[PDB]
């Protein structure tokens, strides 16, 4: 769940990659299991909840870890 | 990693300035809190007991042990990785100079050095 | 000295458990081939075969513990069905068939397959030991519980609680009543009888399916 704060904060390569210092922030999870008989899945985002502001909003579900 | 990090506050302490936040068990048949309706405040119980080998352990990893004078430091000489002296609030800054340069020489930890 | 005598025993017990379950495997394969010949004999003879009646039901408490009457409430305690999806094997005496008939809305039951018996005893099986509820894990665990030259294997247990046993009580009583999980894929209606399209009551051999999702 990628979003942004209003100030920059430490990111994964804050020092190695200055180019990457947004006030953009991201909250990671895993798809955990399918939810319902439709395409929905359950994502736990780490130990924490994802914020309720995230709702209705672009989650980005990555193709990894790959299986296939 | 604590069960509950919040205080178990008294019911409706927030409305009444006089009430201390400190817990009192609710009573009265109609108490929403002792009837334990789901939207209400929780009550303390045995189930919130902290894990028992991490209990009493401050984030430093030490169990605090009160200290008043330089002699107390030797009560912690041999268990200096388990206990950390917390110097009492009322020892003088005078005496604390003495506790502190000695709590340094002995390798005992101090919470407020 | 004793340290190794514990080996002479632990080695001798699987030698026994091997010998036991080799017999039980044969006593199953043989007993059923013999029970196929007869029903197959009879079809050739234009003739029916009255299959021997079940001598063991896997009763399962299926409603919860609230609002239950003093008579049903006692029968469930004597069945040791004190929670929801508890399970016990009770052999089908008339006196039991009259207990089961008294609390059927509270239970699902039927006639366990040998496989159903294996899964419960191996997976969900727990001995009572010093009142402790002890997960089965060793045959050592079983021979200590059952001081009985007959009952040594976990295969001894599965035969007793399936063949109907001479120690069917000696065995099933030393087992804590089984604590099954709710049937995966759900029940149907814990309120109606099975033939009503519900859940409770005798459901014959079908219990193995229902009880399989649980184990």
């Amino acid at each position: 769940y990628v979003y942004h704060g209003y100030k920059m904060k430490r990111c994964v390569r804050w020092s190695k990659a200055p180019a990457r210092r947004s006030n953009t922030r991201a909250i990671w999870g895993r798809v955990t299991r399918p939810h319902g008989g439709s395409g929905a899945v359950r994502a736990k985002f780490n130990g924490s909840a994802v914020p309720a502001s995230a709702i209705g909003k672009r989650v980005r579900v990555y193709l990894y870890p790959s299986r296939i | 990693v604590k069960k509950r990090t919040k205080r178990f506050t008294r019911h409706k302490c927030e409305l009444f300035p006089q009430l201390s936040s400190s817990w009192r068990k609710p009573r009265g048949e109609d108490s929403p809190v002792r009837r334990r309706y789901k939207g209400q405040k929780a009550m303390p119980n045995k189930g919130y007991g902290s894990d028992r080998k991490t209990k009493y352990i401050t984030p430093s990893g030490f169990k605090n042990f009160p200290i008043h004078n330089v002699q107390d430091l030797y009560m912690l000489l041999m268990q200096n990785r388990k206990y950390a002296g917390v110097i009492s609030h009322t020892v003088g800054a005078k005496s604390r100079k003495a506790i502190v340069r000695k709590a340094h020489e002995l390798d005992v930890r101090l919470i407020n050095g | 000295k004793a340290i190794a005598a514990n080996k002479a025993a632990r080695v001798a017990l699987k030698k026994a458990a091997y010998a036991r379950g080799l017999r039980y495997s044969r006593e199953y394969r043989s007993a059923e081939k013999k029970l196929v010949h007869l029903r197959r004999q009879a079809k050739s003879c234009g003739n029916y075969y009255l299959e021997a009646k079940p001598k063991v039901a896997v009763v399962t408490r299926i409603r919860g513990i609230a609002k239950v009457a003093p008579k049903q409430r006692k029968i469930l305690q004597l069945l040791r069905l004190r929670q929801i999806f508890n399970t016990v094997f009770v052999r089908l005496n008339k006196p039991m068939e009259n207990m089961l008939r008294a609390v059927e809305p509270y239970i699902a039951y039927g006639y366990p397959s040998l496989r159903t018996v294996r899964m419960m005893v191996y997976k969900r099986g727990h001995l009572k030991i010093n009142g402790q509820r002890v997960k089965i894990v060793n045959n050592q665990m079983i021979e200590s519980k059952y001081n009985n030259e007959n009952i040594v294997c976990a295969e001894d247990i599965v035969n007793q609680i399936y063949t109907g046993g001479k120690h069917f009580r000696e065995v099933t009583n030393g087992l804590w009543p089984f604590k099954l999980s709710p049937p995966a894929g759900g029940m149907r209606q814990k309120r109606r009888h099975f033939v009503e399209g519900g859940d409770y009551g005798n459901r014959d051999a079908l219990i193995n399916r229902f009880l399989a999702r649980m184990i």
Binding site: Y62, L63, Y64, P65, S66, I68 | - | -
Partner: protein, 132 residues
Amino acid sequence: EYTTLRKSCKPGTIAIILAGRFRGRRVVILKQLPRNGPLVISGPMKYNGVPIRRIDSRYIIATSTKVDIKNVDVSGITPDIFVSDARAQLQKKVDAALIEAIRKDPLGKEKAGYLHSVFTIKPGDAPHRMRW
């Protein structure tokens, strides 16, 4: 040696990079590292600009397409290796071998072009319905 690296990921297979700097890049899997270690996919950089470098098997999609690159000597890819002349020299020695290994195959002209390809989850696109 030990390797649980999955059957779908074999040396000389083409393999989409799902993550990291080289997203969507088809990349031949040159070799798996000496222990159950990360793959060393290579571009070849002559094509898609992917350097010899390590990638975890979880972060690529091993396409069914491959190349019979048993002929190529990727032995110079060892963990101890992991832009300096010794390394710039290494891939040059390798990509030229790896690149010709691609040439030997019938339909080896597409695989050169197939490796110039960049994967992208375009809208309406359903990888889970995809096979590879």
